[PDB]
Amino acid sequence: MEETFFGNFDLASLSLWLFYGFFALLIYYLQTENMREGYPLEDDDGNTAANQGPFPLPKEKTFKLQHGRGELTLPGEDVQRRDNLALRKTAHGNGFPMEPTGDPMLDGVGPASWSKRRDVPELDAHGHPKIVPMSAAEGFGVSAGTDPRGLPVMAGDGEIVGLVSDMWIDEAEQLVRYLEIELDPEWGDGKRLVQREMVRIKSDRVKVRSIYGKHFKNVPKTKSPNQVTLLEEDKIMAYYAGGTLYADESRLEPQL
Amino acid sequence: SKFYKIWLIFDPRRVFVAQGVFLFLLAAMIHLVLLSTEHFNWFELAAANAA
Amino acid sequence: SKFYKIWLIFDPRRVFVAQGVFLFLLAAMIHLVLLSTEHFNWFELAAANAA
Amino acid sequence: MSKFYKIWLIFDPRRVFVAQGVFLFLLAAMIHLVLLSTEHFNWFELAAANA
Amino acid sequence: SKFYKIWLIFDPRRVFVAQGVFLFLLAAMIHLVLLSTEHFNWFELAAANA
Amino acid sequence: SKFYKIWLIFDPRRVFVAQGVFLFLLAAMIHLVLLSTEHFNWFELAAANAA
Amino acid sequence: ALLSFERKYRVRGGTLIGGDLFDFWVGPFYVGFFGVTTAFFALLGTILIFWGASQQGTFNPWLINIAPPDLSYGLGMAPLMEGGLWQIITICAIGAFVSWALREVEICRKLGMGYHVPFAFSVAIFAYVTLVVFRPLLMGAWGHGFPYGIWSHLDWVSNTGYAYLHFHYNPAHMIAVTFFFTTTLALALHGALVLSAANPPKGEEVKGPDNEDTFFRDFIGYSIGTLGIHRVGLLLALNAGFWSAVCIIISGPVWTKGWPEWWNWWLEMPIWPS
Amino acid sequence: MTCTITCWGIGVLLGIMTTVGLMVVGWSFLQGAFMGVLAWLIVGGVLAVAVC
Amino acid sequence: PEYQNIFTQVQVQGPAELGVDNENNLTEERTTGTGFSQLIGWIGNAQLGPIYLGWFGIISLVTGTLWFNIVGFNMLSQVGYSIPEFIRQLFWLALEPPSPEYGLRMPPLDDGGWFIIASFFLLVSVISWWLRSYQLAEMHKMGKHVAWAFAAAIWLFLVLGLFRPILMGSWSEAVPYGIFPHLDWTTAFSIRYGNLYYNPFHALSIVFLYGSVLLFAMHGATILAVTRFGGDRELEQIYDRGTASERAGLFWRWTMGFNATMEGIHRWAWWFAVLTPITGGIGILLTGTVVDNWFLWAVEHNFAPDYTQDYGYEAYTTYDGFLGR
Amino acid sequence: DLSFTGLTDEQAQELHSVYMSGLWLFSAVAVVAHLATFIWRPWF
Amino acid sequence: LSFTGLTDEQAQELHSVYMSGLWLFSAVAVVAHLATFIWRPWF
Amino acid sequence: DLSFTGLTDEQAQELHSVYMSGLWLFSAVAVVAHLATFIWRPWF
Amino acid sequence: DLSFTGLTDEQAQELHSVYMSGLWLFSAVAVVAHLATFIWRPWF
Amino acid sequence: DLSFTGLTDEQAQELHSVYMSGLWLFSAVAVVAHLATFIWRPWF
Numbered sequence A: 001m002e003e004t005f006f007g008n009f010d011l012a013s014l015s016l017w018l019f020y021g022f023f024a025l026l027i028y029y030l031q032t033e034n035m036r037e038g039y040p041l042e043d044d045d046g047n048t049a050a051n052q053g054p055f056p057l058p059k060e061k062t063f064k065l066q067h068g069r070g071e072l073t074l075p076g077e078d079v080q081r082r083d084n085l086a087l088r089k090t091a092h093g094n095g096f097p098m099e100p101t102g103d104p105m106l107d108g109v110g111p112a113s114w115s116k117r118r119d120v121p122e123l124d125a126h127g128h129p130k131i132v133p134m135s136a137a138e139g140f141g142v143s144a145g146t147d148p149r150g151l152p153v154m155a156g157d158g159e160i161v162g163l164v165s166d167m168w169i170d171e172a173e174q175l176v177r178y179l180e181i182e183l184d185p186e187w188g189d190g191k192r193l194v195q196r197e198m199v200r201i202k203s204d205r206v207k208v209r210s211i212y213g214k215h216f217k218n219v220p221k222t223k224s225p226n227q228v229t230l231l232e233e234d235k236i237m238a239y240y241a242g243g244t245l246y247a248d249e250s251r252l253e254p255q256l
Numbered sequence B, C, F: 001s002k003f004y005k006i007w008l009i010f011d012p013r014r015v016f017v018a019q020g021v022f023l024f025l026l027a028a029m030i031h032l033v034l035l036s037t038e039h040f041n042w043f044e045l046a047a048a049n050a051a
Numbered sequence D: 001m002s003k004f005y006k007i008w009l010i011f012d013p014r015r016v017f018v019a020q021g022v023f024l025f026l027l028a029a030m031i032h033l034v035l036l037s038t039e040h041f042n043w044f045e046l047a048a049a050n051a
Numbered sequence E: 001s002k003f004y005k006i007w008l009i010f011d012p013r014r015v016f017v018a019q020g021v022f023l024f025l026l027a028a029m030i031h032l033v034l035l036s037t038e039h040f041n042w043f044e045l046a047a048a049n050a
Numbered sequence G: 001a002l003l004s005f006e007r008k009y010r011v012r013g014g015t016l017i018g019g020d021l022f023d024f025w026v027g028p029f030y031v032g033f034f035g036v037t038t039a040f041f042a043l044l045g046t047i048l049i050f051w052g053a054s055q056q057g058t059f060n061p062w063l064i065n066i067a068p069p070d071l072s073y074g075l076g077m078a079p080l081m082e083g084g085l086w087q088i089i090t091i092c093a094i095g096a097f098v099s100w101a102l103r104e105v106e107i108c109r110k111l112g113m114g115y116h117v118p119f120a121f122s123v124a125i126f127a128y129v130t131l132v133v134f135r136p137l138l139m140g141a142w143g144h145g146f147p148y149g150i151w152s153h154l155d156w157v158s159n160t161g162y163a164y165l166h167f168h169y170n171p172a173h174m175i176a177v178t179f180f181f182t183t184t185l186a187l188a189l190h191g192a193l194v195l196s197a198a199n200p201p202k203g204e205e206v207k208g209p210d211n212e213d214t215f216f217r218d219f220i221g222y223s224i225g226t227l228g229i230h231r232v233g234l235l236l237a238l239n240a241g242f243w244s245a246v247c248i249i250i251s252g253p254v255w256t257k258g259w260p261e262w263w264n265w266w267l268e269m270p271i272w273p274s
Numbered sequence H: 001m002t003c004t005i006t007c008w009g010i011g012v013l014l015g016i017m018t019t020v021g022l023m024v025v026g027w028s029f030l031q032g033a034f035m036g037v038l039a040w041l042i043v044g045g046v047l048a049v050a051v052c
Numbered sequence I: 001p002e003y004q005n006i007f008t009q010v011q012v013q014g015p016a017e018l019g020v021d022n023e024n025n026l027t028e029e030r031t032t033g034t035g036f037s038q039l040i041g042w043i044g045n046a047q048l049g050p051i052y053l054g055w056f057g058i059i060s061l062v063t064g065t066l067w068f069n070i071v072g073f074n075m076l077s078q079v080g081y082s083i084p085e086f087i088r089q090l091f092w093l094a095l096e097p098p099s100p101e102y103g104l105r106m107p108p109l110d111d112g113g114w115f116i117i118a119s120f121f122l123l124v125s126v127i128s129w130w131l132r133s134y135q136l137a138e139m140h141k142m143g144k145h146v147a148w149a150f151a152a153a154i155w156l157f158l159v160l161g162l163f164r165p166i167l168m169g170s171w172s173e174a175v176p177y178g179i180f181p182h183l184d185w186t187t188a189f190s191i192r193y194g195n196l197y198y199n200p201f202h203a204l205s206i207v208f209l210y211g212s213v214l215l216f217a218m219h220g221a222t223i224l225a226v227t228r229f230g231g232d233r234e235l236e237q238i239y240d241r242g243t244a245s246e247r248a249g250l251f252w253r254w255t256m257g258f259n260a261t262m263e264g265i266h267r268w269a270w271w272f273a274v275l276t277p278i279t280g281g282i283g284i285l286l287t288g289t290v291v292d293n294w295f296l297w298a299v300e301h302n303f304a305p306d307y308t309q310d311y312g313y314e315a316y317t318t319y320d321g322f323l324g325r
Numbered sequence J, L, M, N: 001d002l003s004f005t006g007l008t009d010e011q012a013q014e015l016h017s018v019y020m021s022g023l024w025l026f027s028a029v030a031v032v033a034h035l036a037t038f039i040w041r042p043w044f
Numbered sequence K: 001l002s003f004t005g006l007t008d009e010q011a012q013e014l015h016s017v018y019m020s021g022l023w024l025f026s027a028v029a030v031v032a033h034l035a036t037f038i039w040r041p042w043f
């Protein structure tokens, strides 16, 4: 207690070193638990990298997915990998950026890149699709803020492409996830979705600064107008953010 | 008179609890005020009266 | 003479609740400031009168 | 006067009794603590005073 | 008299769980109050007697 | 006689874990207050006995 | 190396002042124009710390102490071994921190994600900036910055804290601390929510957002949501960093007296019946 | 918003006015500020609820 | 500029969401009344959900109010039931722990006896609330991470007021129940036992406390940066990761050389938060009981810096020079 | 007629009739209590 | 014309009893102030 | 008639009789408690 | 006739009898404990 | 026929009988322990 053993190493020192050993084990546990995705490492050529780091991959853990979606083991065989990427290396070595072969936004390679998620809509606790248009919502309505329905949509370059037809809401958590854009015949056809986190709503109009007017006709569509699958949901969101770098050369080129 | 029409506006089950907490809080506050004053503090007066 | 139609724009239950809170708060505030001054502090006057 | 039984037509017996039980005990505990604070009515200490 | 009707209002499961905890806390509280006073602290009285 | 019906409304698994935890804590807590008391501290009393 | 999904995101572009000249990766790190300046400033600052440690006479990490100059030197540059080295390391530290934040802008611009992280880091930079260059200017001496030591800068906090007579009564420190405790409280509960939902007892299905949303509804009667917690949590942490900047920038150049005596306004009001 | 933001703006203007109004008749800046801050919370909340 | 997802630009309200429920049948003890607030909806969910009226929660609420009231009426009795003085001195009044000359023995009511009674009720309320968190997670078939994270806060809570005073030999080591008084205790505790800066476990707790705020600014901004990719839906990103998890990981892999998963982030988030009171609880528990002077502990363990300059103002300036005369 | 909470005119009349009796009874005890405490230690 | 869904038939009736309550509230306030003025005048 | 809690007139009269019987019994104990407390060191 | 809990009048009647038997037993030992303490060291 | 916990009457009768046997066994040891310690050092 108040007396020391082998030198100045008292009980406070013993507790301090005991925590040091525990923390080292904790850091190993914490770091390994983050290796369940994206591992093993690879090089720019796609082969397995010679170096895998100082932390070995953890034991396989299983998630009992709900709504009868089977099980899920994270370490090994990521099903979200995209096969045909439209990129080729700018250098024969490693550590250098890729240059898209074709249209970066259409192919979805850079900031426009999506992930091969499940081709099924996300489900709430009831088993119903999580994101649905507010028209199909039972008793939902705008409670505060500016209602964007009917407001014209202004692209990044200022072009007016159409008016908002509906908002795809998240009835499980009661928030807006998308805005439906009814494209004018000049700027495209059909309807397209833009995520709420990428859109800015003004008093009279609603604007997206990430995508120019000519790129709305190429926004990924949804197979059904009543629900969106995670694959389409990932493609749609990625496309708009891809325009933050690919709408024009001025965004990709250095700003100074 | 005709003061009974207040119940056509006020909800009896929401105003009865309103005055119920209000009356006790008012009663408790006034009792505390009396205890603060040394003239009306009946607890200290009993001690002083006994001497 | 034609003030009866103030309620045409004011909701009774919406203004009665505010009025009831306002009247008690005003009455307490006037009572409190009246207790602040030593001339109208009826608790201290009672103590001084019996002294 | 005798129509006080109608209070149960507004208040359900379950919620009022639970509120009443907590209120009465807290009131009883509040008062007992107050007397315990005062030196004259602290029955525990005056027992020690009597030898 | 006829207070048996209280069980038609109070859940027997609920009231007993509250009663069990309430009685013990009111039994520990009072016991500590006597332990506070030197007149009723039976532990100190044994020391004083001896 | 008829106290056996307490198990018809209390879950035996829930009560026993509460009973076991409560019994030990009470047994321990009483053992500490004896240690705090100098008259009933059997540890320091043995030293006093040994003189 | 690269992750299993990193190849696609490694595209050229999204640079502020640099171009393809610095647009490359070194291992996992991304080098940019500001990654070049970060590497230069961080290495120069780190080496000068050890150079000062060599001249200080000790290499013990606990005992290494590079201190600002005396208050007599004012805002001018001091001799290198008399405090001037601390000023240069401060200049290197500001360059390293600003470039690191600007590099993070290049990281997120290349990935198409928002600029929330570099903005959030800039608040922490502002907390350091207000501690080392803003507060000294308001006092007219570089010697008011904290020394660059593991335990020496703890002595500065202790001495500065007691230099205002029980710093706990500082109103901005009072606000800043309760943001620090709430952020850790929010971090624990939010981290627990996701882990609990994702890691149920064995043999039980994983819980979705609805199950974790209703848990605090049954726990504390209101759940801020999956999206709400991240934005309120960022503001909780940024407020903690911002109010920490306030509590130290108002200490010397605003309230030279003791901090309890600041509360004399509350104790001495006309409303109170003295 | 709009109405609520404007009502809050009226309160902060009133809070500033009360901050300097009490300073004129005495008090101090910190004492006046607390009343000004308190006024902003009260009348700002009341206006944002009743007017809007 | 681009829309930063700090305040929602439009919010919708539908039927109130009661809960998920299962055969554990949580509905009976769940309230049937909910409300909606648009002011809080600008930053989070706008629904004021229904309390689950469990027995652990009710006992914690009732006994917590008992501790709150007992401290309150002693505070009101401090100034002789003078409400204006009670309001004026609200931040200064407290329920002081017992005097040190009583030890573990029960002190008189005016000298900490009511402190023990209030502390006992506070202990019951705090523990009962933890049992509520454990039971609620059990009834929801969720992980007990909330209960374990709370239990870490209980550790420092128990060390500060229960564990340390028991094995320090006196109840006087507990923390007073006051706004400013427990700040005075916090400062006096460091002064009495040297300097808690030089307590390694206090330093360790500070490391995790800064790290906890650091992570949750990192995590809060990173999720808001990938919220354009549905990053706020963390749970679905754990089961089926999209570009939100990948971009968030690659942002920190390209910045600081390593990253986390959408699930592994909360393990990092959980542990620094949990380690903050665990390390602090250890440091307080062995402060005074083991080490009675932390600076002297630092001196003998060679991590207290040494200064070679003079300690007087006369060595740097003069009184006339400071005054400008 | 006006009914913001139901309570058809007949229902409100009988509710106030017993409420007034309760109010008068509560105030009658208050008057007696105030008269009794005024005799004990008057405040005027 | 109307903002709270009331007509002239009952809004006039509502004000009729509100003034009765206002006068009764003022009447007991007038005598209260008159009694206080006699006891402790402030003019 | 005007049953906010699904409780009829007959139940209210029956329940109030029990409540008043309990109330008077509780008040009777309090009165005897106060009367004895006033005999032993009164507060007036 | 009215029972929020759901248990019948007969079920309430027997449960109260058992509860009272427990209450009197709990009270009876409490009175003896309270009585025996008074001979030990009275507080009046 | 009032099993709130889904446990029949017969099972409760044997549950209490065994529980009392444990309770009396626990109390009997406590009584002997209390009797032994009172002779060693009485507290009354």
Ligand code: BCL
Residues within 6 Å of the ligand: G097, G124, G125, G127, G128, G131, G156, G157, G158, G159, G160, G161, G162, G166, G167, G168, G173, G176, G177, G180, G240, G241, G243, G244, G245, G247, G248, I186, I187
């Ligand atoms: C006697 C001492 C007084 C006291 C006096 C002070 C003083 C004096 C100060 C504080 C300040 C603070 N006090 Mg105080 N304070 C006291 C008691 C407390 C208590 C408590 C429980 O008792 C608490 C919780 C706090 C809490 C705090 C926080 C509000 C704040 C800490 C700094 C911060 O926010 O980050 C701000 C700092 C930064 C964010 C650093 C930025 C980091 C940079 C950008 C990145 C670093 C990179 C670096 C190179 C590492 C890279 C290396 C590796 C490659 C990774 N105080 C005691 C009573 N307190 C400090 C403050 O506010 O500072 C603004 C301050 O100056």
Ligand code: BCL
Residues within 6 Å of the ligand: G157, G181, I126, I153, I154, I156, I157, I160, I185, I186, I187, I188, I189, I190, I191, I195, I196, I197, I201, I202, I205, I206, I207, I209, I276, I277, I278, I279, I280, I281, I282, I283, I284
């Ligand atoms: C002069 C002041 C001393 C000082 C003395 C102390 C003391 C004394 C302590 C700390 C401790 C802490 N100090 Mg220090 N500390 C100082 C300077 C600092 C500085 C700084 C920049 O200067 C900082 C950042 C810190 C930082 C910290 C944290 C790391 C740590 C507390 C973590 C915590 O919240 O636990 C979380 C736990 C709690 C706060 C209590 C948990 C509360 C319970 C669980 C909740 C009950 C709720 C209650 C019933 C109310 C409910 C009401 C609701 C509304 C319903 N200290 C100086 C040296 N410091 C603590 C420690 O040592 O940790 C090892 C501590 O005890």
Ligand SMILES: CC[C@H]1c2cc3[nH]c4c(c3C)C(=O)[C@H](C(=O)OC)c4c3nc(cc4[nH]c(cc(n2)[C@@H]1C)c(C(C)=O)c4C)[C@@H](C)[C@@H]3CCC(=O)OC/C=C(\C)CCC[C@H](C)CCC[C@H](C)CCCC(C)C
Residues within 6 Å of the ligand: G038, G041, G042, G043, G044, G045, G046, G049, G089, G092, G093, G096, G097, G100, G104, G117, G118, G120, G121, G122, G123, G124, G125, G127, G147, G148, G149, G150, G153, G237, G238, G240, G241, I210, I213, I214, I217, I218, I221, I255, I256
């Ligand atoms: C500012 C608001 C809050 C916050 C946020 C925050 N911090 C951040 C970020 C964010 C959002 C990042 O994105 C960024 C990051 O990438 O973290 C991993 C970061 C960061 N904040 C960090 C630390 C940190 N944050 C802290 C706190 C906080 N983090 C605040 C509470 C603290 C405290 C107060 O204890 C520390 C120590 C780093 C991990 C990282 C910044 C990395 C960086 O700047 O890298 C470039 C520089 C170097 C590699 C070395 C430079 C060396 C210098 C040239 C010389 C030495 C200077 C220094 C002043 C000496 C110190 C001596 C002694 C006092 C130790």
Ligand SMILES: CC[C@H]1c2cc3[nH]c4c(c3C)C(=O)[C@H](C(=O)OC)c4c3nc(cc4[nH]c(cc(n2)[C@@H]1C)c(C(C)=O)c4C)[C@@H](C)[C@@H]3CCC(=O)OC/C=C(\C)CCC[C@H](C)CCC[C@H](C)CCCC(C)C
Residues within 6 Å of the ligand: D026, G181, G182, G184, G185, G188, G189, G192, G220, I060, I061, I063, I064, I065, I068, I069, I125, I126, I129, I130, I133, I146, I149, I150, I151, I152, I153, I273, I274, I275, I276, I277
């Ligand atoms: C991991 C460490 C961090 C942490 C974590 C943490 N805290 C937690 C949890 C977790 C994981 C919970 O699950 C739990 C919780 O439910 O949070 C919402 C909690 C909690 N930690 C809390 C506070 C808290 N945490 C703190 C800090 C921390 N806890 C660390 C930073 C601090 C500090 C040190 O400053 C505090 C003060 C609470 C919000 C909550 C614990 C509350 C609880 O469950 O029981 C406590 C008591 C009550 C609820 C009863 C209080 C009494 C009344 C409600 C008050 C008075 C009401 C009214 C005035 C009555 C008037 C009556 C009269 C009119 C008669």
Ligand SMILES: COC1=C(OC)C(=O)C(C/C=C(/C)CC/C=C(\C)CC/C=C(/C)CC/C=C(\C)CC/C=C(/C)CC/C=C(\C)CC/C=C(\C)CC/C=C(\C)CC/C=C(\C)CCC=C(C)C)=C(C)C1=O
Residues within 6 Å of the ligand: G026, G027, G029, G030, G031, G035, G036, G037, G038, G039, I211, I214, I215, I218, I219, I220, I222, I223, I245, I246, I248, I249, I250, I252, I255, I256, I257, I258, I259, I260, I261, I262, I265, I268, I269
């Ligand atoms: C859900 O979403 C999320 C994720 O999951 C998708 C995440 O993961 C994260 C990230 C958060 C995590 C918890 C993940 C794990 C991370 C941590 C535990 C750390 C964060 C917590 C802390 C308490 C901070 C601890 C600090 C650490 C670990 C240090 C990291 C910071 C540093 C500054 C050090 C690293 C930097 C270095 C080495 C320098 C950078 C390099 C350059 C700029 C390159 C420059 C090069 C040149 C110019 C060329 C010269 C080349 C040379 C000399 C060759 C040398 C080569 C080298 C490699 C050095 C978040 C927020 C998130 O929300």
Ligand SMILES: COC(C)(C)C(=O)/C=C/C(C)=C/C=C/C(C)=C/C=C/C(C)=C/C=C/C=C(C)/C=C/C=C(\C)CC/C=C(\C)CCC=C(C)C
Residues within 6 Å of the ligand: B019, B026, B030, B033, C024, C027, C028, C031, C032, D003, D004, D006, D007, D009, D010, J011, J014, J015, J016, J018, J019, J021, J022, J023, J026, L002
């Ligand atoms: C700070 O300043 C200082 C100077 C210190 C200060 O003190 C300031 C004091 C100030 C400002 C005084 C403010 C006091 C005021 C304004 C007095 C309000 C008090 C009032 C108004 C008394 C209501 C009594 C109501 C009862 C008690 C009814 C009893 C009802 C009974 C129980 C019947 C209920 C049952 C039914 C109705 C059944 C009907 C049902 C059906 C028909 C189904």
Ligand SMILES: COC(C)(C)C(=O)/C=C/C(C)=C/C=C/C(C)=C/C=C/C(C)=C/C=C/C=C(C)/C=C/C=C(\C)CC/C=C(\C)CCC=C(C)C
Residues within 6 Å of the ligand: B003, B005, B006, B008, B009, C026, C029, C030, C033, J002, K010, K013, K014, K015, K017, K018, K020, K021, K022, K023, K025
């Ligand atoms: C700081 O400065 C110092 C100098 C200190 C200060 O003191 C400043 C003082 C200042 C500024 C004075 C501010 C006071 C003012 C302006 C006085 C407003 C007060 C007023 C106006 C009194 C209304 C009373 C009306 C009632 C209370 C009616 C009662 C109504 C009854 C209850 C009937 C209700 C029922 C119905 C209507 C039923 C209808 C229904 C159907 C028809 C269905």
Ligand SMILES: COC(C)(C)C(=O)/C=C/C(C)=C/C=C/C(C)=C/C=C/C(C)=C/C=C/C=C(C)/C=C/C=C(\C)CC/C=C(\C)CCC=C(C)C
Residues within 6 Å of the ligand: B024, B027, B028, B031, B032, D027, D030, D031, D034, E003, E005, E006, E008, E009, L011, L014, L015, L016, L018, L019, L020, L021, L022, L023, L024, L026, M002, M003
């Ligand atoms: C600073 O403050 C200081 C100065 C300290 C202070 O002292 C302030 C004190 C202040 C302000 C006094 C505030 C106290 C007041 C106002 C006293 C309220 C107290 C009252 C009114 C007592 C009711 C008692 C009624 C019972 C307890 C009946 C028992 C009922 C029994 C149990 C029967 C129930 C059973 C059934 C009904 C079954 C029937 C069911 C069916 C038929 C189904």
Ligand SMILES: COC(C)(C)C(=O)/C=C/C(C)=C/C=C/C(C)=C/C=C/C(C)=C/C=C/C=C(C)/C=C/C=C(\C)CC/C=C(\C)CCC=C(C)C
Residues within 6 Å of the ligand: D025, D028, D029, D032, D033, E012, E019, E026, E029, E030, E033, F002, F003, F004, F005, F006, F008, F009, M014, M015, M018, M019, M020, M021, M022, M023, M026, N002
């Ligand atoms: C500052 O405060 C200071 C001064 C410190 C202070 O002291 C304040 C003290 C204050 C305020 C005193 C407040 C105390 C009060 C009011 C006393 C309440 C206490 C009561 C009322 C005692 C109930 C006892 C009931 C039992 C124990 C029954 C036993 C039940 C038995 C076990 C039967 C259970 C049922 C079955 C077995 C079968 C049933 C089931 C079926 C038939 C299915």
Ligand SMILES: COC(C)(C)C(=O)/C=C/C(C)=C/C=C/C(C)=C/C=C/C(C)=C/C=C\C=C(C)\C=C\C=C(/C)CC/C=C(\C)CCC=C(C)C
Residues within 6 Å of the ligand: E028, F029, I068, I069, I070, I071, I072, I073, I075, I076, I116, I119, I120, I122, I123, I157, I158, I159, I160, I161, I162, I174, I175, I176, I177, I178, I179, I182
């Ligand atoms: C209108 O309102 C009225 C009604 C007036 C009112 O009430 C208002 C109430 C008002 C204003 C009170 C406001 C309270 C305030 C500001 C106090 C803040 C509180 C703070 C800062 C707490 C710090 C210390 C906490 C620890 C650290 C505890 C440690 C607890 C330990 C762990 C307990 C351990 C248990 C025991 C020691 C018992 C042992 C005995 C047995 C087991 C038998």
Ligand SMILES: [Fe+3]
Residues within 6 Å of the ligand: G190, G194, G230, I219, I223, I234
């Ligand atoms: Fe998160």
